[PDB]
Amino acid sequence: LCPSDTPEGEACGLVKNLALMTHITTDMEDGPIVKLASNLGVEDVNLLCGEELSYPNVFLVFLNGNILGVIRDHKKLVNTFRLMRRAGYINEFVSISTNLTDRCVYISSDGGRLCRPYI
Amino acid sequence: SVAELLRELSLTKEEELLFLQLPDTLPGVGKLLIRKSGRVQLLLGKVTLDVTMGTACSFLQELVSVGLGDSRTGEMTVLGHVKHKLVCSPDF
Amino acid sequence: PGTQMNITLGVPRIKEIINASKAISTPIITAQLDKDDDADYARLVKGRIEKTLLGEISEYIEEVFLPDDCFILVKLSLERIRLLRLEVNAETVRYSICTSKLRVKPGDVAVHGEAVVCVTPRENSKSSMYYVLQFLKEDLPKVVVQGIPEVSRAVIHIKYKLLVEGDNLRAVMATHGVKGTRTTSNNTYEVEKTLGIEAARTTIINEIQYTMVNHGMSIDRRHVMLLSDLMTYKGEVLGITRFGLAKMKESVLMLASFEKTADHLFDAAY
Amino acid sequence: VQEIDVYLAKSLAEKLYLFQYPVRPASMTYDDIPHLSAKIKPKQQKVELEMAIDTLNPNYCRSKGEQIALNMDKQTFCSSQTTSNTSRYAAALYRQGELHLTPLHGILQLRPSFSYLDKADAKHRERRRVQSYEFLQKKHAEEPWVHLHYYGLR
Amino acid sequence: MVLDKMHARARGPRAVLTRQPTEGRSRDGGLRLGEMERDCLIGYGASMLLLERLMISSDA
Amino acid sequence: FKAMGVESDQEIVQMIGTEEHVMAAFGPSLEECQKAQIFTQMQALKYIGNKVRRARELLASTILTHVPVKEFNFRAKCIYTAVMVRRVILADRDYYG
Amino acid sequence: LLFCPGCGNGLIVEEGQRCHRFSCNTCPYVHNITRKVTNRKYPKLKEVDDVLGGAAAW
Amino acid sequence: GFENRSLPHFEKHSKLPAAKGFVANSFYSGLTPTEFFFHTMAGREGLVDTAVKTAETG
DNA sequence: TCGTCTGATCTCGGAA
DNA sequence: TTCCGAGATCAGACGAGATCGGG
RNA sequence: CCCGAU
Ligand SMILES: [Zn+2]
Description:
Shape of chain A: elongated
Number of strands of chain A: 6
Helix content of chain B: under 10%
Number of strands of chain B: 8
Protein name (chain A): DNA-directed RNA polymerase III subunit RPC2
Strand content of chain B: 35-45%
Bound molecules: zinc ion
Binding site for Zn(2+) 1 (chain G): 4, 7, 24, 27
Strand order of the largest sheet of chain B: 2-8-5-4-3
Largest sheet of chain A: 4 strands, mixed
Subcellular location (chain A): Nucleus; Cytoplasm, Cytosol
Oligomer: part of a larger assembly
Keywords (chain G): Antiviral defense, Disease variant, DNA-directed RNA polymerase, Immunity, Innate immunity, Leukodystrophy, Metal-binding, Neurodegeneration, Nucleus, Transcription, Zinc, Zinc-finger
Number of helices of chain B: 1
Strand content of chain A: 15-25%
Family (chain A): Belongs to the RNA polymerase beta chain family.
Structural class of chain A: alpha+beta
Radius of gyration of chain A: 18 Å
Order of helices and strands of chain A: EHEEHEEE
Distance between the termini of chain A: 19 Å
Radius of gyration of chain B: 16 Å
Helix content of chain A: 10-25%
């Protein structure tokens, strides 16, 4: 968003303006996202309650807000999806992000996310 | 601990039941290779190299392998307990 | 000029003063001491007036399982109690574990060791076998051992004085070491309840003229000498809200032109 | 470089059903061979057994008496299934010289069945939707003729 | 531009309900001497102005 | 949690925290407060929901935490509630993710 | 929180003869004089600082 | 605003100057893109507060 | 949108 | 045993600049 | 109600 383009008065920071090189995303199907998630390594509903806990190697994959299993190695998952997206097998817009404070990786195929390109 | 099980399997000859999540590949003797540095790779059928390494914490519960023989006409018999799970992933 | 540690100083301070609310955010009572020349003596006064929960001063507490009972135990860090200048002892804790609303009101709580460990076994009723002991392990390291319970914490400042972030004024004014003749608040209600109305007039003069010179914004005192003297002339401090106008004015349309036009017109027809 | 080979062992794995226990991790508890009174279903196993309680712990006594039904005392189980797609997991028995793959059937978790408090409340009373499916099983729940026994088999 | 904003109202239409001058320049205006400007006229002590400015030339 | 099918209390802590250090202070909070009234039963603990919801609540627990899907296999629903509790014991509204 | 092997319903201590009889099916482990230990070490209030006049001039 | 980092150009947990709001260039030599953003962020707190203060002091 | 003040029921506690 | 009175704990309220301009 | 002025 533009930092300096805003009204003043009632809407001093409540009516923003999009910047130049942005792109709002549209929705898509979640088929190949799940299909690559379950190959790359995830498992849920068979794991003992204890697993998903303070143990470091339990990053739990979340897609669009629904848990899709847990991965022992977060890096392989974030990196492999990212190489796959760059290769073009997964839609360019989908984003894999990782929060290490709470071990949840976050595959978002939401549609409506503010996006932008980088080199 | 990824290749340790194989070395521990090497340390005691006792047969160990293992849990394997193969990738979702339909059928279109397999070979397992342990790379130097512990990077176990299963060079499976079709000569594809699938990397399988580590898994969820296991043994934190009792997981038991049982062969249901339809005991009304057979027997349900526990054959083994469980060991660390193993997950197989395709590689790129 | 309204248009033009932490203490609130802006318009949310002046709006907080004019309302004269009973409870304000960040109330601060400053206090001068008798012997303002050494940090250790004012240390001793500081621990005397700021609250310290049983939890803050102790080592590894737990229940301990002995045949036919389960008594809790507290190891009570004694290096600390001498480090933080404060005067607790296991007798003083035992009086403070008592009369502390946790129903331990009898002499069930004991005093073991070398005045270094207290023990309370078990209550009488309300699932007394275990469920009060798992209840007891939570409320026991949150009873105030000593000090004014209301006061959040007291911070020294250098001659020496100490400012508190609390509200219980006369319990602070009466402690040993603080010359209670020279101690002020910034909560104009707790000066009105404790120090009379005339000291509550002088804080409304001061704490407006303190927050007005803090923001630049010079102002005559004769304006604040009028606003304070209106605000406290009918008995008690009447803050200028919707509610304080009812206790200040008799005429209806002056109240009815202000807020609550519906109720003020019907009630004055009743 | 252990190059151990994996046999795609065709030894019938249709019999193989993994059983899980999110109940017994405290002291390497093994379920123990002696207990019988075995009852098992093919779909939604609901393993019902003779997990008779010890008497080394001191009698338990009146509260056991207070239990109402205990039949020594069955500590049965209802199988929480997790069989959505059930071929993603198919490992078997592995030496350091040989490796035998076998594709299992649906894994089933086995938490403890109560039904003592369930039946207990009913007793006081005396004083969902298509829950069982269209065919009411009429069979899977009937199947418990069970024999857990010890045999070295592959 | 000041041609769109120049405005004066001598005596014109009054609103049908409250018989005060209307709001807007499109409706020949009358600008609200608001209650904040009432206090300014209070603080000057001008008493006979406020009777003139809020009874005589608004709602007589 | 007992209404959701996981009836035992060992499972619930195993969900919330196996490493205990602060998730032990989940213990005397609620699973004791659950146990303080003798109410260990799955069907009976739908019943307390069956009163306040203004056997009949197997369905009306689908209008609670919706998008975690259930086919009357509530195991996926439990972890998502357990992770919601997991955050609190470990504890930005304007941030553009 | 010590759990029950057999139902898993959490620790209850009956003060009769030192057992752990749970609200469910009795599994009372009558722990002998083994001494229970739960010392959850708290925090210790740590001294003070004089809030000095080293800097206020700027 | 991000995790342990003011803008994703700096490193995580950087407490460095010119990574948490210091601008080195004056207005003659012109601000740089991170520097221009932090000056905008500190500039809007002027504009935001006059909207809300007059909503209260009125 | 809380934020405020109000005023309306409960409960552990002392006096006769 | 009694209980009469009082500190504790929810629920509901009715507030939140000023003007001017046009569709 | 939006927008816009200050
Ligand atoms: Zn039990």
